[PDB]
Amino acid sequence: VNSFSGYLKLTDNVYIKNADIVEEAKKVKPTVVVNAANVYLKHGGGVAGALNKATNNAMQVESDDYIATNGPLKVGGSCVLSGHNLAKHCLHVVGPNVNKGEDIQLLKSAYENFNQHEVLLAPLLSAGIFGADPIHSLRVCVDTVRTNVYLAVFDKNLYDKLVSSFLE
Ligand SMILES: Cc1ccc2cc(C(=O)O)[nH]c2c1
């Protein structure tokens, strides 16, 4: 469990790797994988779609049941559902979608949810279609998360920009 390999330590508690978060979950067997969720837990693309596809749609079926029963999440909020074949748990975290006019200050609230778990495999939040600057998202992660977070960044050019941003 939690067999993280080849990470670069950026701070006392934040680590980073140029890797596919699905292949990392399969290798590492983490206690927790973080999903970059939306408030209706509709896993239609990006990390959410990739994680759901790796679970053979189990995650979407679970999530549909959760939302029908319990209603939508709030921006900045989270829920813990099954990790299926990827992890013990999936922490579904909703970062703000600034492309849709949501407030970037809620990225802090989103990352604060990581402090309820000793160690996490995670993507950067509010990246991709959510429209935040990835360098800013890494900074909020570093400033907010105090538990151990292993970040997986798929794109090499972005990984390099993030690491360079951070150590040069
Ligand atoms: C699929 C999977 C991956 C990691 C873990 C870790 C646990 C545990 O601590 O009980 N269960 C898992 C299941």
UniProtKB/Swiss-Prot annotation:
It catalyses: Thiol-dependent hydrolysis of ester, thioester, amide, peptide and isopeptide bonds formed by the C-terminal Gly of ubiquitin (a 76-residue protein attached to proteins as an intracellular targeting signal). Changing S164L: In strain: Gamma/P.1. Residues 1-168 form the Macro domain. It is a multi-pass membrane protein. Inhibited in vitro by GRL-0617. It is found in: Host endoplasmic reticulum membrane. Responsible for the cleavages located at the N-terminus of the replicase polyprotein. Participates together with nsp4 in the assembly of virally-induced cytoplasmic double-membrane vesicles necessary for viral replication. Antagonizes innate immune induction of type I interferon by blocking the phosphorylation, dimerization and subsequent nuclear translocation of host IRF3. Also prevents host NF-kappa-B signaling. In addition, PL-PRO possesses a deubiquitinating/deISGylating activity and processes both 'Lys-48'- and 'Lys-63'-linked polyubiquitin chains from cellular substrates. May form homohexamers. Interacts with N protein. This is Papain-like protease nsp3. The gene is rep.
